[PDB]
């Protein structure tokens, strides 16, 4: 993984040889976190050193795709489905594993934790809800955090979309995209969907993977 630069000069301004998935810090973007296997490293951008590497061998879930993220208050980390208070390098609460793949994500309200299909609490740690249409889908929120997007990661991948609400998790729409969805990104200003779809049949020998822009809210 490489922190490049995009002001006007294009260079690897810091290099990593280790982590399979790097991610910024949300509110104050001076921190970049990244995760190899079950080990997640906190880096700075100014000097690029290891700030604090957090891991507890007694407590990890060993998910298949671990991706440590931050809460929007920049205080909690979901490594291996374990919260982490970044003030004093301690673990808070392991969750119960159910689905072998997905290590979870924060909901933008700062009140919940969304493990794969189980909706948790941040202060009471109670299972509020369970949405079975979230079965192994990568989630993307709006910039306002008012809708959740869903793309299947099932072998085919993404025979449709999945439009969710961010308050009550009611399904809005499953629009049928006949090809296979591989990636999904949306605007900050809520007008387009960046959709990587694969042409042809399910062919690992020939992949014609195009990008198709949708428009939000037009028949």
């Amino acid at each position: 993984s490489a922190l490049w630069g995009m002001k006007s000069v294009f260079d690897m301004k810091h290099s990593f040889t280790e982590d399979h998935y790097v991610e910024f810090s949300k509110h104050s973007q001076d921190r970049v976190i990244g995760t190899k296997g079950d080990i997640a490293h906190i880096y700075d951008i100014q000097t690029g050193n290891k700030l604090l590497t957090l891991f507890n061998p007694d407590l990890a879930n060993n998910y298949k795709r671990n991706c440590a993220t931050f809460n929007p208050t920049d205080d909690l980390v979901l490594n291996d489905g374990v919260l982490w208070d970044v003030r004093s390098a301690q673990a808070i609460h392991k969750f119960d594993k159910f689905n072998m793949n997905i290590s979870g994500v924060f909901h933008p309200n700062g009140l919940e934790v969304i493990i794969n299909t189980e909706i948790w609490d941040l202060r009471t740690f109670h299972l509020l809800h369970t949405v079975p249409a979230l079965d192994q889908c990568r989630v993307v929120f709006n910039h306002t955090g008012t809708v959740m997007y869903g793309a299947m990661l099932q072998s085919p991948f993404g025979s449709s979309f999945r439009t969710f609400n961010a308050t009550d998790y009611k399904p809005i729409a499953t629009i049928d995209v006949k090809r296979n969805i591989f990636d999904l990104c949306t605007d900050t200003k809520d007008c387009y969907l960046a959709v990587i779809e694969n042409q042809g049949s399910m062919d690992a020998l020939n992949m014609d993977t195009v990008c198709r822009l949708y428009e939000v809210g037009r028949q």
Binding site: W4, G5, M6, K7, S8, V9, F10, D11, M12, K64, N101, S155, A204, L205, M207
Partner: protein
């Protein structure tokens, strides 16, 4: 008003050499995850159809990187 940045990144001017610096490396990882049966057979299948013409040389780095991406994406730890 967006100014796309100047491409002062890692350039690849010896394309006849940078391929040779990496076509072994494309073989140096596919053997670490896959048996050599498909590796020689697909390499023969393009060499019967593209030959020694650079149109299979980049094209195997197409097909190997197109599979090694998706084989690290479907959910096999090695294969």
């Amino acid at each position: 008003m967006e100014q796309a940045p100047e491409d002062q990144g890692p350039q690849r001017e010896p394309y006849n050499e940078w391929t040779l610096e990496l076509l072994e490396e494309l073989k140096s990882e596919a053997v670490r995850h896959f048996p050599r049966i498909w590796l020689h057979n697909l390499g023969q299948h393009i060499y019967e159809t593209y030959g020694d013409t650079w149109a299979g040389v980049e094209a195997i780095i197409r097909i190997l990187q197109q599979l090694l991406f998706i084989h690290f994406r479907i959910g096999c730890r090695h294969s």
